[PDB]
Amino acid sequence: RPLDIRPNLLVVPTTLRSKAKEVVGVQRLANGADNPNFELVQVLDTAWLN
Amino acid sequence: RPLDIRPNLLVVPTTLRSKAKEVVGVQRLANGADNPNFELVQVLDTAWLN
Amino acid sequence: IITPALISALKTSFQKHFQDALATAPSTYLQVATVIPSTTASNTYGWLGQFPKLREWIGQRVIKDMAAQGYQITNKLFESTVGVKRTDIEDDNLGVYGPLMQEMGRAAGAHPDELVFALLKAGNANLCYDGQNFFDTDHPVYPNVDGTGTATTVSNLFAPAADPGAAWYLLDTSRSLKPLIYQERMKPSFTSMTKEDDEQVFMADEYRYGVRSRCNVGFGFWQLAAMSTEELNQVNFEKVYDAMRNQKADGGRPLDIRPNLLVVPTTLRSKAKEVVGVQRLANGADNPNFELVQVLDTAWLN
Amino acid sequence: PKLREWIGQRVIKDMAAQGYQITNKLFESTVGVKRTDIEDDNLGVYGPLM
Amino acid sequence: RPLDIRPNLLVVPTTLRSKAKEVVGVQRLANGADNPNFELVQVLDTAWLN
Numbered sequence: 001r002p003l004d005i006r007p008n009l010l011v012v013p014t015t016l017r018s019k020a021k022e023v024v025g026v027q028r029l030a031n032g033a034d035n036p037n038f039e040l041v042q043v044l045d046t047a048w049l050n
Numbered sequence: 051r052p053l054d055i056r057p058n059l060l061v062v063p064t065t066l067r068s069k070a071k072e073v074v075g076v077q078r079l080a081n082g083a084d085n086p087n088f089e090l091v092q093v094l095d096t097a098w099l100n
Numbered sequence: 101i102i103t104p105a106l107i108s109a110l111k112t113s114f115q116k117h118f119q120d121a122l123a124t125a126p127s128t129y130l131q132v133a134t135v136i137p138s139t140t141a142s143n144t145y146g147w148l149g150q151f152p153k154l155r156e157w158i159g160q161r162v163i164k165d166m167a168a169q170g171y172q173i174t175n176k177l178f179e180s181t182v183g184v185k186r187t188d189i190e191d192d193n194l195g196v197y198g199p200l201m202q203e204m205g206r207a208a209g210a211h212p213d214e215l216v217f218a219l220l221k222a223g224n225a226n227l228c229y230d231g232q233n234f235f236d237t238d239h240p241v242y243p244n245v246d247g248t249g250t251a252t253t254v255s256n257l258f259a260p261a262a263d264p265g266a267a268w269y270l271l272d273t274s275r276s277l278k279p280l281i282y283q284e285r286m287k288p289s290f291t292s293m294t295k296e297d298d299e300q301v302f303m304a305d306e307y308r309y310g311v312r313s314r315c316n317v318g319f320g321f322w323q324l325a326a327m328s329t330e331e332l333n334q335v336n337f338e339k340v341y342d343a344m345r346n347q348k349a350d351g352g353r354p355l356d357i358r359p360n361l362l363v364v365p366t367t368l369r370s371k372a373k374e375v376v377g378v379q380r381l382a383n384g385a386d387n388p389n390f391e392l393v394q395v396l397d398t399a400w401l402n
Numbered sequence: 403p404k405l406r407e408w409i410g411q412r413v414i415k416d417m418a419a420q421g422y423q424i425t426n427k428l429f430e431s432t433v434g435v436k437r438t439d440i441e442d443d444n445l446g447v448y449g450p451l452m
Numbered sequence: 453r454p455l456d457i458r459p460n461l462l463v464v465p466t467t468l469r470s471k472a473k474e475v476v477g478v479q480r481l482a483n484g485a486d487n488p489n490f491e492l493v494q495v496l497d498t499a500w501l502n
């Protein structure tokens with residue numbers, strides 16, 4: 001029976017902020033088409049994860 | 051002696067208004083590159099140019 | 101049918117037009133120039149090149165005695181005049197003479213920028229205070245403060261071996277004094293005359309409408325400005341920037357220069373934008389020159 | 403017109419003795435009623451028409 | 453037992469800024485793999501160090 005899980009945020013180190021931006025938070029994909037996951041999650045960059 | 055002209059607006063036919071909008075007026079390009087022509091000119095849609 | 105009341109009303113209308121044109125006059129020369137008002141024939145600038153620093157208390161306080169030689173700006177004057185033909189007044193075609201004087205006022209406002217940038221473009225043909233070209237390959241810098249010993253070669257002009265390209269400039273504005281100085285002796289003023297018994301109203305036919313001014317532009321100190329006629333490329337830009345940042349005055353003490361803005365001709369503005377100012381490179385990403393300098397578009401450089 | 407530089411001389415406006423001959427024109431339109439629907443009291447027409 | 457050593461910023465002379473950007477600032481290599489050092493430290497160029 002599904003639990004109805006709703007992922008909220010994805011945590012990455014400060015090193016992967018560019019990848020977080022490309023996946024979410026920008027309107028350009030790698031191929032240049034409109035994102036299907038724009039502003040889907042609230043990224044939280046941190047220095048505690050290097 | 052240069053006149054310091056300032057091209058303000060771009061007028062296109064109704065049949066190419068979408069092409070003008072997607073080529074110019076959006077900061078995301080088809081391939082995924084930043085467009086240096088965002089909001090550079092004010093497009094004026096008009097139905098009298100066919 | 102024509103009386104001095106109409107003349108006065110026309111004068112008031114033209115004054116309003118001129119004031120409105122001046123109010124909306126764009127100003128651009130202030131970005132890369134400094135205004136120093138004067139109250140005499142000219143200004144002497146022999147203290148330029150001196151780089152005030154802080155000094156210890158090892159002993160007697162050191163004070164500099166700058167040379168009596170000066171830049172000798174030698175300010176000049178400008179005006180423009182327009183006519184009426186005295187003919188269309190009878191036809192009452194007064195709708196014209198509004199945009200004409202508005203354009204005249206706009207051109208008067210833009211004149212200082214035009215002159216400043218025209219002088220900048222001809223830097224190789226003009227000499228600064230020290231007696232050498234503003235953009236030169238053999239600028240002198242001595243190894244000692246007093247100015248003794250073998251000199252060293254410092255270059256701020258970069259040119260290609262052949263196939264010369266467009267000329268672009270890299271300037272600095274963080275400092276208190278910009279590379280160029282724009283003198284302003286008298287604010288431009290309008291000079292009208294419409295009497296029926298005066299010159300050029302009886303002789304020929306032209307109701308003169310003039311606008312005077314008195315200004316001139318001079319160089320600052322060359323350590324900031326630079327010229328590069330080579331192709332605008334990322335590698336070339338990086339070379340110019342890291343050569344500029346590695347410039348030391350007499351005594352081998354870096355000045356901590358901060359190249360602020362880049363100026364390019366209108367025919368290469370798109371190439372400058374696409375080379376610098378776009379996140380994605382030709383093949384990759386993270387262009388290391390994003391928003392590093394503020395491009396200043398200008399039509400005065402052809 | 404542009405601000406001119408002194409060379410010990412004076413420059414008066416350049417252009418003169420010329421015209422464009424716009425030759426303004428006139429336009430008109432007309433509509434009818436047919437005189438019939440007045441009797442029927444179908445006055446709903448001729449509102450959107452005007 | 454150690455402390456929390458977290459190298460934050462890196463300083464280079466102006467003659468090595470190009471190499472600093474090359475080592476940190478490029479994502480794809482010749483092979484086609486992402487660099488794990490992107491935006492790991494805050495570069496701070498200075499002219500006081502010659």
